[PDB]
Every structure is written in C-alpha cells, then in structure tokens.
Amino acid sequence: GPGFDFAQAIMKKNTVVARTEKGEFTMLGVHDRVAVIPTHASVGETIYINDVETKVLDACALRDLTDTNLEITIVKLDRNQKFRDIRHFLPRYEDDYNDAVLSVHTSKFPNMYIPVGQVTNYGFLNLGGTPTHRILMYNFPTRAGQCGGVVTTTGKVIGIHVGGNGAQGFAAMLLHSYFTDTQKHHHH
Amino acid sequence: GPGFDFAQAIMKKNTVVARTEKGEFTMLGVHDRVAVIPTHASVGETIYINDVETKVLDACALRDLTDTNLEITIVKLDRNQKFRDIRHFLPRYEDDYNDAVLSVHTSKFPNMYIPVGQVTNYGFLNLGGTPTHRILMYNFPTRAGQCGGVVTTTGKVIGIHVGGNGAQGFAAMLLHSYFTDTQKHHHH
Numbered sequence A, B: 001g002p003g004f005d006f007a008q009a010i011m012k013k014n015t016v017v018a019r020t021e022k023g024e025f026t027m028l029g030v031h032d033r034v035a036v037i038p039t040h041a042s043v044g045e046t047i048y049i050n051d052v053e054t055k056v057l058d059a060c061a062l063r064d065l066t067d068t069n070l071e072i073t074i075v076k077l078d079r080n081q082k083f084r085d086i087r088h089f090l091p092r093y094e095d096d097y098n099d100a101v102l103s104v105h106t107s108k109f110p111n112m113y114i115p116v117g118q119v120t121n122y123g124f125l126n127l128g129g130t131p132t133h134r135i136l137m138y139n140f141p142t143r144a145g146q147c148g149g150v151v152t153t154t155g156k157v158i159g160i161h162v163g164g165n166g167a168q169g170f171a172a173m174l175l176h177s178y179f180t181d182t183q184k185h186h187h188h
C-alpha cells in the first residue's frame, strides 16, 4: 500500500506554506533553516512563510554541469525554528519508485495526500519552455496549486512537484548530495 | 493515525464521478446499483457516471420527520456493474468520531485524501439558506469541488461532504437504516 503515514510525518514536521510574487507553494524544510522551492517560484530577498514575511538569506537555483535547469532552489531562511533534519531520508542516486504519495500544504489545501502510483526517472522535460533535467514522472493528472508538493515513498523523500501536462505530473529530484555541509566558493 | 488504507479501499471499489446540471460530485455506491449524492446536486432522470450518461431509475431526497432536509439523495442507477455491498460499514446511530478522512474522486481530483481530524455530531445547519439536520462537522477548510466526498474512520463510512464556511466542513450523516431492504409505499 502507499506510505501515507510516512507522508503525513514529513508534512507535519517539515512543510510550510511559502508565498512569492508567483503565488503559494508547498515548501519542504530539509535541515536547520534550509528548505526547497521550485525555481519558477522566483524567490526574491524576502518570502512569506505561513503568512509571515521572512528574509531569504540565501537562494541557490540548481543547475547541472550542462548548465541546465534542475528546477530546485535551495533557500536559507531567517526564522527561529530549525527544521527536523530529514537528509537521511533523501535518496543517494537517481531511481524509479513504486506507489508514491504526493502531499500538498497550501492555504487552499492545508494537508492533502494523492497516491500517484509508479514514479519513473524521466530525464529531460521542456518545462513551460525551459529545458529541465533530472525529472521524475507519474501518471496522474496533477494541477496548478500542487507545485512544491512533496513526493515520498516509505522512508524516502524523492522530489518536489513542479509540472504537469494534464495527464502526467513531474517532480524535480531531490538527492542527498544537494545538502551535504560543504565548501568555500563565491556563488552569486 | 488516520485510517488511510480503509479510505482507499472504499474509494477504489465504491466511488464513481457523478455529474449533474450542477457540476461534478464524488459519488458513493452503497450496494447493488444504489448510490448517494448530495440533494443540492439536483439529480434528474439521467446522470453522468464516469462520463457515461446513465438513467436514474429512482431518486429519494431524504427528509426527517420534521420535514427537514437531510441533504442525502439515494439514487438507483441503470448500470451493469453492482457495487460491493458496504452497508455493514455504515454506523447504526448518530455519533462523534476521531481522526476522520475525507476522500474525493472527481475529474479534477481522481483520488485525494484529507485528514479532517475530529468529527462532531453538529445537528442543525443553515446550508446555503436551506435548514438541514443530522450534520457532522470537522474543523477543516473544505472547498468547492469536495461535495460528495466520503468521510470515513477505520471500519466506518460515516457521511458525505455537503458544505463548508471557510473554516469548518460539514457532512450529511449516513446511517445503516437508510439502506435496509424494506416496504410497500407510493413515494413520488
């Protein structure tokens, strides 16, 4: 069966509602004050988190070595609460998955769970005109309002929802090495 | 925890998408070719079931002995498939419930699950200007599109969603005695 209990534990402790100039997105907090949001949310230097204006201390829009959009933006937030560290539930490698759940936490849908079935490592996607890599696909008719929704199986947080064509939905992958405590590098 | 597995088994075997002049509603099939839909769906002599036009052989809009709306309409459909008989999961009596799930099956949301928390026997509701009785209430911001959504706990199908005021949601109760094989009576 789908891992609804795991999905709910992730939603309860690790999601907030984020709101940018582009609208509301489910937001997964990963560790400390670090979270993710789809790049097309257009994060600026402030963002609303559960309707509280919040400084964005850092925002890194991920791209691969072909200089192609991965659609994941990692943000560091000026907030008091730390997120539960869920890096150990992130997969190490690209993979296909069985019986996944997509979970949403927005003003409109404060906690909703959608079994999306099998998830395949899809690869290239033309996402609203932007070439994008490392995409996961599920055969489910996902909708506007679900961007940032968290995709899980039991024990794994595998991606966040970023797109759909009316019949299929698409998530950007989350990989463990995106969040490892790292180096010294001018990035802006 | 919420009974997601029970909710999913009910959705899988016992729901269809119904569409009337008023729009789409999740539809719970109860037994044989008998199903329910909110009275305010305005069922006529035909209805679309999973987009197939279907004769409504009977429609009974339930009212209590005070001649007040209960908001449940029981329909008998001209279809080949029988519904799995789930009358044994219907409660005998009015009651309050813990940790319920609201499940939706529409074109827009083909299977989505919302934990709504505690459900209380609420009683009277002015529902869009119509006095209505036997209402269940949950503190969840339910939305248009969710009418007919099935409310369960484990082992019990307790109501269908009919209304909301922006902060709370409301279901019409389902009781076991609504569906017992019965009498001889001119009802139209």
Ligand SMILES: *[C@@H](CC(=O)OCC)[C@H](C[C@@H]1CCNC1=O)NC(=O)[C@H](Cc1ccccc1)NC(=O)[C@H](CCC(=O)OC(C)(C)C)NC(=O)OCc1ccccc1
Pocket (backbone or CB within 6 Å): A022, A023, A038, A039, A040, A041, A125, A126, A127, A128, A129, A141, A142, A143, A144, A145, A146, A147, A162, A163, A164, A165, A166, A169, A170
């Ligand atoms: C979430 C963000 C959102 O709702 O918009 C705020 C501006 C969207 C989820 C999608 C939309 C439809 N169903 C879904 O699952 N994602 C998008 O809209 C993305 C762009 C985006 C991503 C993240 C943040 C902000 C914006 N674009 C698409 O998914 C695009 C379809 C857009 C669309 O039709 O939306 C409506 C609601 C206006 C109808 N789909 C897409 O590119 O699919 C791939 C494709 C390849 C080739 C040909 C056609 C499509």
Ligand SMILES: *[C@@H](CC(=O)OCC)[C@H](C[C@@H]1CCNC1=O)NC(=O)[C@H](Cc1ccccc1)NC(=O)[C@H](CCC(=O)OC(C)(C)C)NC(=O)OCc1ccccc1
Pocket (backbone or CB within 6 Å): B022, B023, B038, B039, B040, B041, B125, B126, B127, B128, B129, B141, B142, B143, B144, B145, B146, B147, B162, B163, B164, B165, B166, B169, B170
């Ligand atoms: C499901 C049916 C639907 O979407 O409309 C098709 C015509 C609705 C679910 C509600 C709507 C808002 N959130 C929900 O959970 N139900 C209704 O709209 C019902 C009427 C109804 C029922 C069944 C079938 C068809 C129609 N009406 C209400 O719930 C009403 C609010 C209507 C409303 O504001 O909807 C929008 C989307 C246009 C904003 N709520 C209500 O009566 O609450 C009790 C109340 C008591 C005292 C004062 C104010 C409210």
